[PDB]
Scaffold this active site. Structure first.
Site, PDB file in Angstrom:
ATOM      1  N   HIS A 134       5.582   6.742   6.378  1.00 15.15           N
ATOM      2  CA  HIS A 134       5.366   6.372   5.076  1.00 15.15           C
ATOM      3  C   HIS A 134       4.937   7.459   4.210  1.00 15.15           C
ATOM      4  CE1 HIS A 134       1.388   6.434   7.157  1.00 15.15           C
ATOM      5  NE2 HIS A 134       0.830   6.943   5.902  1.00 15.15           N
TER       6      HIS A 134
ATOM      7  N   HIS B  83       0.756  -1.222  -0.079  1.00 17.66           N
ATOM      8  CA  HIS B  83       0.147   0.011   0.062  1.00 17.66           C
ATOM      9  C   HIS B  83       0.979   1.415   0.072  1.00 17.66           C
ATOM     10  CE1 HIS B  83      -3.541  -2.592   1.041  1.00 17.66           C
ATOM     11  NE2 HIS B  83      -2.883  -2.976   2.063  1.00 17.66           N
TER      12      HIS B  83
ATOM     13  N   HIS C 135       3.717  11.109   6.241  1.00 15.40           N
ATOM     14  CA  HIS C 135       3.202  10.918   7.592  1.00 15.40           C
ATOM     15  C   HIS C 135       4.019  10.105   8.434  1.00 15.40           C
ATOM     16  CE1 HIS C 135      -0.950  10.963   5.237  1.00 15.40           C
ATOM     17  NE2 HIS C 135      -0.529  12.268   5.434  1.00 15.40           N
TER      18      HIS C 135
ATOM     19  N   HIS D  91       2.332   9.047   0.356  1.00 15.77           N
ATOM     20  CA  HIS D  91       1.212   8.860  -0.443  1.00 15.77           C
ATOM     21  C   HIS D  91       1.594   9.610  -1.658  1.00 15.77           C
ATOM     22  CE1 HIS D  91      -1.395   7.173   2.638  1.00 15.77           C
ATOM     23  NE2 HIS D  91      -0.574   8.047   3.550  1.00 15.77           N
TER      24      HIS D  91
ATOM     25  N   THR E 183      -6.413   7.996   7.193  1.00 10.38           N
ATOM     26  CA  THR E 183      -6.683   7.975   5.943  1.00 10.38           C
ATOM     27  C   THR E 183      -6.653   6.819   5.064  1.00 10.38           C
ATOM     28  OG1 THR E 183      -4.561   8.221   4.916  1.00 10.38           O
ATOM     29  CG2 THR E 183      -5.702  10.294   6.012  1.00 10.38           C
TER      30      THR E 183
ATOM     31  N   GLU F 213      -2.854  14.197   0.418  1.00  5.91           N
ATOM     32  CA  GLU F 213      -3.985  13.635   0.832  1.00  5.91           C
ATOM     33  C   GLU F 213      -4.624  14.845   1.266  1.00  5.91           C
ATOM     34  OE1 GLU F 213      -3.177  10.158   3.396  1.00  5.91           O
ATOM     35  OE2 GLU F 213      -4.365   9.307   1.825  1.00  5.91           O
TER      36      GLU F 213
END
Ligand SMILES: Cc1cc(C)nc(Sc2c(F)c(F)c(S(N)(=O)=O)c(F)c2F)n1
Ligand SMILES: [Zn+2]
Length: 261
Positions: free
Chosen positions: A89, A64, A115, A91, A196, A102
């Site tokens: 990690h 992910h 994050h 996004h 999230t 995000e």
């Protein structure tokens, strides 16, 4: 199983994870109508973030995102309780539309988002227990824009071509995690929201720093093209792209800012 694209994508997360259709969901658009300055918001202090260079930390492609495990002695001070780090990690989007943060600010995405996850270690024995309690988690968000090369983010990104597939791992020598933070960390947005990703627990105290950091064109394209959600030798790879959630409704409520406008 959940994903960001197709039948197991985010409009279907509520089927397996009921909190994804519940209250207090993140991320949100940070915009004037919903902001208020709170002068009692003080600087966080980042303790133990200068990780030993003689220690290694595990980097994993978990299907992910790419995640770096962080030690228990790292924490933030300044909230009602001490919160201890557990992992960071990212996004991001994709090369044809490289806008995959995000949170957004006045409607604009940024290129990507970091994050740094923490849990309330004064009140709870671990992050799993904390994850079901109000204010159990505190996540720091750094907005990322394309521009200048970033040597400190490269301490993670230089390993990407070696964790290309789900389940792969690398070891990263410790380095100063504070160098991933932007200028003027005393300036931030603060609100109560959720994870999230599934299970979307509504238990996160968010701090999104006001200012973005920059990474180069080449670093953003490595982040968007090196990784897959599938195992090596899965005959039908899925690229790890667009692993960000759409912004959520945010009504009858306020985001508090430590800066004035
Ligand atoms: C619900 C739960 C329990 C445990 C032990 N770790 C986690 S790790 C985690 C987390 F806490 C987060 F807040 C998030 S995020 N995207 O920062 O909301 C996440 F992706 C995560 F992977 N989450
Ligand atoms: Zn995240």
């Amino acid at each position: 199983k959940w994903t960001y694209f197709g039948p197991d994508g985010e409009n279907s997360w509520s089927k397996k994870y009921p909190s994804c259709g519940g209250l207090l969901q993140s991320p949100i658009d940070l915009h004037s109508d919903i902001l208020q300055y709170d002068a009692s918001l003080t600087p966080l202090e980042f303790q133990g973030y200068n990780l030993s260079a003689n220690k290694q930390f595990l980097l994993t492609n978990n299907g992910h995102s790419v995640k770096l495990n962080l030690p228990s002695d790292m924490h933030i001070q300044g909230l009602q309780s001490r919160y201890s780090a557990t992992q960071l990690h990212l996004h991001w989007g994709n090369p044809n539309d490289p806008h995959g943060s995000e949170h957004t600010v006045s409607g604009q995405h940024f290129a990507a988002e970091l994050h740094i996850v923490h849990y309330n270690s004064d009140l709870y024995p671990d992050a799993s227990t904390a994850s079901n309690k109000s204010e159990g988690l505190a996540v720091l968000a750094v907005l990322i824009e394309m521009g200048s090369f970033n040597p400190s983010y490269d301490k993670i990104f230089s390993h990407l071509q070696h964790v290309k597939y789900k389940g792969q791992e690398a070891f990263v020598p410790g380095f100063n995690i504070e160098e991933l933070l932007p200028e003027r960390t005393a300036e931030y947005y603060r609100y109560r929201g959720s994870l999230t990703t599934p299970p979307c627990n509504p238990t996160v105290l968010w701090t999104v720093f006001r200012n973005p950091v920059q990474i180069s064109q080449e670093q953003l394209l490595a982040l968007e093209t090196a990784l897959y959600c599938t195992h090596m030798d899965d005959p039908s790879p899925r690229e790890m792209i667009n692993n960000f959630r759409q912004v959520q409704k945010f009504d009858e409520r306020l985001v508090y800012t430590s800066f004035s406008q």
